[PDB]
Amino acid sequence: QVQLVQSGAEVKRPGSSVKVSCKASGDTFINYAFSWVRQAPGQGLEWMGRIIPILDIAHYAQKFQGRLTITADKSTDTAYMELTSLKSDDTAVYFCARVFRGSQYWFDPWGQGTLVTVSSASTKGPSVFPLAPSAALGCLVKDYFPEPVTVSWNSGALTSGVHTFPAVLQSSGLYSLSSVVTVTYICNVNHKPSNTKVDKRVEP
Amino acid sequence: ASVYAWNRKRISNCVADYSVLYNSASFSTFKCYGVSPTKLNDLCFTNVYADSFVIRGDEVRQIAPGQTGKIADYNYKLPDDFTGCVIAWNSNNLDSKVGGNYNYLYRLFRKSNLKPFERDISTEIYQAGSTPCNGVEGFNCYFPLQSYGFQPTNGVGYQPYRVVVLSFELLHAPATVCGPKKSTNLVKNKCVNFNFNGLTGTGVLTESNKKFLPFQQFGRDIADTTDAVRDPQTLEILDITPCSFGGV
Amino acid sequence: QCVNLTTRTQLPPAYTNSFTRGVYYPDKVFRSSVLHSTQDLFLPFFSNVTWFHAIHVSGTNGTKRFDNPVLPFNDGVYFASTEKSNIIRGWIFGTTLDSKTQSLLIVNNATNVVIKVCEFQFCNDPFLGVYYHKNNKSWMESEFRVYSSANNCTFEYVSQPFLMDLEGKQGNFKNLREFVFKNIDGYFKIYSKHTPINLVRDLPQGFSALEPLVDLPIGINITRFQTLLALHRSYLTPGDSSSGWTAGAAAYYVGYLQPRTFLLKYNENGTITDAVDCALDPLSETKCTLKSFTVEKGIYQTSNFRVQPTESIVRFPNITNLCPFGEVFNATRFASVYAWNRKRISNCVADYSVLYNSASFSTFKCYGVSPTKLNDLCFTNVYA
Amino acid sequence: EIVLTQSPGTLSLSPGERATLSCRASQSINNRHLAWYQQKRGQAPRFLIYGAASRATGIPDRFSGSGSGTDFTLTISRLEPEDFAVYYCQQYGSSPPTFGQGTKVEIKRTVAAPSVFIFPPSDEQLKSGTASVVCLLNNFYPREAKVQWKVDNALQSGNSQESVTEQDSKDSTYSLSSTLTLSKADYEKHKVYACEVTHQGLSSPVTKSFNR
Ligand SMILES: *[C@@H]1O[C@H](CO)[C@@H](O)[C@H](O)[C@H]1NC(C)=O
Ligand SMILES: *[C@@H]1O[C@H](CO)[C@@H](O)[C@H](O)[C@H]1NC(C)=O
Ligand SMILES: *[C@@H]1O[C@H](CO)[C@@H](O)[C@H](O)[C@H]1NC(C)=O
Ligand SMILES: *[C@@H]1O[C@H](CO)[C@@H](O)[C@H](O)[C@H]1NC(C)=O
Ligand SMILES: *[C@@H]1O[C@H](CO)[C@@H](O)[C@H](O)[C@H]1NC(C)=O
Known part of the structure; x- marks a missing residue:
């Protein structure tokens, strides 16, 4: 019934501002307030602020008074959240919540979250490497910023023990993953945001 | 503004005309309480007010001395001795947008009643039943304010009606809010029908030998009768002796 | 700025008696040779007022006392000032005085009398002061440290430029300035009556009517007020900026107004000369019921005596014949929406409180009557 | 609070x-x-x-x-x-x-030991400066792992600080990866290269490792 549809991922630039929406539905927009809560990777949740559509009052947190501006249009039933002067450590999943119109409230209805990455990089990233062993074989990628990458071994045929590891930025800044499967030999790497869906053969 | 946060406007030190508003043919209701819709341009008041709020059509009748209900007991209450004129008119042309205008609120729930001429902008959670709400909103815990939802496609009882409530007040203090009256010449030594700032009557206006204090303007006698006043224009003391009368 | 004064000797507050004080003009109508009775906010006769003082010459640690506390403003304050060197030169009115609401300011410097109604951030100890010099025998007033901030104003009103004395004088006090502050009908009425006297302590007795002074239409919430004094800081007694300050010699009395009935007498020239205060003693009650000031020998019926009810008792028959609410709610098997059952339970004393305050029913939408007051509505026959 | x-x-x-x-x-x-x-x-x-x-x-x-x-x-x-x-x-x-x-x-399942596998650099790896030697630790129940990639004479991190985590798989097993990032400068001439795993259950299982 009550579905809080949000926007998608926003590839923004460092030192700028973003604007994430929250499409409210189900019930009336004026009988329920809305709060935004961010989630840093593996660091719990963090309450940023809350707005009252019926009262047009938006009281933020002590660490967001000045940079957080949350609005809400009572005509399209959409809650907006804008953050100015974004730092590098703002790659959190911003969630939308339909809180009550009281002083104390609980975040019962949630949304879907938006993984907005502020610190960004360039394009033309990954380049598959063979990594020939001397009992398994994998197609390793390196130095790609755009998150939505897919490394399907053998075009999705030998997907038995791939276990694609979560792409994490070790020391470069552009996170990378590795799909290593047990022992044709040509894998299939396809970058959805970019236009370089090249492949490579590995000789175990 | 809203009904629960009506704006009070103080009017003083000016000349106010009311005939141009009654004959404007735009105000729907022009009900006067304590005074008449006419014969008001010849009177002078001491301190009047001007309230402004927007209610619906079916609640315009509740803005009156003695009327009770929801908008007249929790948002704006008028006293039983209200001496003024209620002015309201339909405004379904700029206060009702497409989809619904939610910029007007009214207090729906309240613990006690509302004393006349009182403003309350508190937004605490109304504790209904017996369970303490403690700030949360849930069962037996309703929000005190509610939106109207003014839509242009509604009946005559669901359209915005801007209401202006003038609260006249006549006291013995120096009156400021006067009417459009032409000041004549002060005639003395003859029983004539005088017309002061609100103390009318007939009598022989002569010169008095008493001492009016700088703050005193009117005067009275041992039998609660006005026998001396102070001129509005000048600073002379005019003793009001009664007109000549007797028996035959 | 704020300067927290130190080196102040502590002393419990003293209390004096206001012998027939606080009577002002109730209205603005001239009346002569009449005994009109009024019922307004006056000061009761022989009332227990609070006495403040600042007398200290040298001592060992002295009797340092700078009485500027936060005092309540219930319905009006009868402010008297028996001074000789113009110590009390302003007041402060408000409710919180934390730069969060509208407040008054009645400061009286040596140039003007500022009555601005801006929103100030008042310190914990607002004060004024003069600066006496040794090379020059003048009195330079440059210690105006009352407020620090200046937010929105309501009614800013400056006064005409003058030259106040602000000199130090020793001897008997000869300046009695009474003030009756009151905030009713949105007007902050101020009264004043300056009367010379020759007294140093135990403020004299006598009748003195206070004429109105101003009718400032501010209409703000006034709950707590604080007096403003001026210290006579000089180079004779050195020290720190908050320790070397030297106080003068003054004393101000604070009172409270209560709704009382009076029988004030107007003179032949139209001035109040006496009052009866028909709430103090049966003698005054009789003097007012007889509409005079001199009673005769006899018995006079003044009022009536009625014992007021203390408690309240409500009695009703026993609550029996409970309606079978457990059958319709706590049932083994219910019917479908198609063949919905019917139950016209009537002739019963049903309590709808066990169903409202149950925390089990999800929805309790009461279409029609309110969710409450259902225990005060006697119906003929209800259905389920 | x-x-x-x-x-x-x-x-x-x-x-x-x-x-x-x-x-x-x-x-x-x-x-x-x-x-x-x-x-x-x-x-x-x-x-x-x-x-x-x-x-x-x-x-x-x-x-x-x-x-x-x-x-x-x-x-x-x-x-x-x-x-x-x-x-x-x-x-x-x-x-x-x-x-x-x-x-x-x-x-919660039975404790299982991982299977160490070291992938030496390929042909086009010692010339581009992107040596990404991966140490695969697959099918190990205790997700607490202290793999000490012996890239030098000691157990230093150097260019191996990935610490790639995992998630709860279908068979309640986990897999960890240990990749390198150094160019053809350290791996071209060093002391020893042997992926040592101080896993909960064993002491130091080293298998399929090439020195230098
Ligand atoms: C005022 O009250 C004090 C005690 O608080 C008492 O000692 C004093 O006698 C009283 N003064 C009167 C009743 O005049
Ligand atoms: C005046 O009022 C505004 C808002 O009405 C407020 O922001 C401001 O702080 C006040 N004071 C001054 C000095 O502007
Ligand atoms: C004035 O302020 C005080 C401060 O607590 C409050 O108790 C009182 O109710 C206020 N009065 C009005 C009329 O708002
Ligand atoms: C009243 O005024 C007269 C002047 O006409 C004066 O002689 C008399 O003393 C006054 N009365 C009082 C009590 O001052
Ligand atoms: C039904 O039973 C519950 C628990 O036994 C009780 O709390 C409730 O009051 C009962 N219903 C009625 C209508 O009495």
Whole structure:
């Protein structure tokens, strides 16, 4: 019934501002307030602020008074959240919540979250490497910023023990993953945001 | 503004005309309480007010001395001795947008009643039943304010009606809010029908030998009768002796 | 700025008696040779007022006392000032005085009398002061440290430029300035009556009517007020900026107004000369019921005596014949929406409180009557 | 009042046994104002219990919580396989809403040793300066891993500080990767290269390693 549809991922630039929406539905927009809560990777949740559509009052947190501006249009039933002067450590999943119109409230209805990455990089990233062993074989990628990458071994045929590891930025800044499967030999790497869906053969 | 946060406007030190508003043919209701819709341009008041709020059509009748209900007991209450004129008119042309205008609120729930001429902008959670709400909103815990939802496609009882409530007040203090009256010449030594700032009557206006204090303007006698006043224009003391009368 | 004064000797507050004080003009109508009775906010006769003082010459640690506390403003304050060197030169009115609401300011410097109604951030100890010099025998007033901030104003009103004395004088006090502050009908009425006297302590007795002074239409919430004094800081007694300050010699009395009935007498020239205060003693009650000031020998019926009810008792028959609410709610098997059952339970004393305050029913939408007051509505026959 | 700390942190429990999640608060919550959530992998948190006593809309009776002043406890009786996510706490008795850390409940199975595999650089690896030697630790039950990639004479990190985590797989197993990032400068001439794994259950299983 009550579905809080949000926007998608926003590839923004460092030192700028973003604007994430929250499409409210189900019930009336004026009988329920809305709060935004961010989630840093593996660091719990963090309450940023809350707005009252019926009262047009938006009281933020002590660490967001000045940079957080949350609005809400009572005509399209959409809650907006804008953050100015974004730092590098703002790659959190911003969630939308339909809180009550009281002083104390609980975040019962949630949304879907938006993984907005502020610190960004360039394009033309990954380049598959063979990594020939001397009992398994994998197609390793390196130095790609755009998150939505897919490394399907053998075009999705030998997907038995791939276990694609979560792409994490070790020391470069552009996170990378590795799909290593047990022992044709040509894998299939396809970058959805970019236009370089090249492949490579590995000789175990 | 809203009904629960009506704006009070103080009017003083000016000349106010009311005939141009009654004959404007735009105000729907022009009900006067304590005074008449006419014969008001010849009177002078001491301190009047001007309230402004927007209610619906079916609640315009509740803005009156003695009327009770929801908008007249929790948002704006008028006293039983209200001496003024209620002015309201339909405004379904700029206060009702497409989809619904939610910029007007009214207090729906309240613990006690509302004393006349009182403003309350508190937004605490109304504790209904017996369970303490403690700030949360849930069962037996309703929000005190509610939106109207003014839509242009509604009946005559669901359209915005801007209401202006003038609260006249006549006291013995120096009156400021006067009417459009032409000041004549002060005639003395003859029983004539005088017309002061609100103390009318007939009598022989002569010169008095008493001492009016700088703050005193009117005067009275041992039998609660006005026998001396102070001129509005000048600073002379005019003793009001009664007109000549007797028996035959 | 704020300067927290130190080196102040502590002393419990003293209390004096206001012998027939606080009577002002109730209205603005001239009346002569009449005994009109009024019922307004006056000061009761022989009332227990609070006495403040600042007398200290040298001592060992002295009797340092700078009485500027936060005092309540219930319905009006009868402010008297028996001074000789113009110590009390302003007041402060408000409710919180934390730069969060509208407040008054009645400061009286040596140039003007500022009555601005801006929103100030008042310190914990607002004060004024003069600066006496040794090379020059003048009195330079440059210690105006009352407020620090200046937010929105309501009614800013400056006064005409003058030259106040602000000199130090020793001897008997000869300046009695009474003030009756009151905030009713949105007007902050101020009264004043300056009367010379020759007294140093135990403020004299006598009748003195206070004429109105101003009718400032501010209409703000006034709950707590604080007096403003001026210290006579000089180079004779050195020290720190908050320790070397030297106080003068003054004393101000604070009172409270209560709704009382009076029988004030107007003179032949139209001035109040006496009052009866028909709430103090049966003698005054009789003097007012007889509409005079001199009673005769006899018995006079003044009022009536009625014992007021203390408690309240409500009695009703026993609550029996409970309606079978457990059958319709706590049932083994219910019917479908198609063949919905019917139950016209009537002739019963049903309590709808066990169903409202149950925390089990999800929805309790009461279409029609309110969710409450259902225990005060006697119906003929209800259905389920 | 503004501080919430999870006592368990992690809980390796078998499906069927009762669970106990605690949330310690600095000050005392007056009207037991605490709420519990459940955030699955790549999903939004799910509201479970309001007031730490009663479920909100349709949460089964298996999720129960106690009421206290400074320390609340959640009792997930008869734990099901689908109830394996991260649970959070939220105290709504103060002005700023504060959350907790999060307790992840995983599947408890038999302890299994990993299988070490080292991938030496390929042909086009020592010329581009992107040596990405991977040490694969697959099918190991204790996710606590202290793999010490001996890239030099000592157990230094150097250019191997990936620490790639994993997730709860279908067969309750986990896989860890240890890739390198150094160019053709350190690997071209060094002391020794042997992926050593100080895994919980063994001492130092080294298999298929090439020195220098
Ligand atoms: C005022 O009250 C004090 C005690 O608070 C008492 O000692 C004093 O005699 C009183 N003064 C009167 C009644 O005039
Ligand atoms: C005046 O009022 C405004 C808002 O009405 C407020 O922001 C400001 O601080 C006030 N004071 C001054 C000096 O502007
Ligand atoms: C004035 O302020 C005080 C401060 O607590 C408050 O108790 C009182 O109710 C206020 N009065 C009005 C009329 O708002
Ligand atoms: C009243 O005024 C007269 C002047 O006409 C004066 O002689 C008399 O003393 C006054 N009365 C009093 C009590 O001052
Ligand atoms: C039904 O039973 C419950 C518990 O036994 C009780 O609380 C409730 O009051 C009962 N219903 C009625 C209508 O009495």
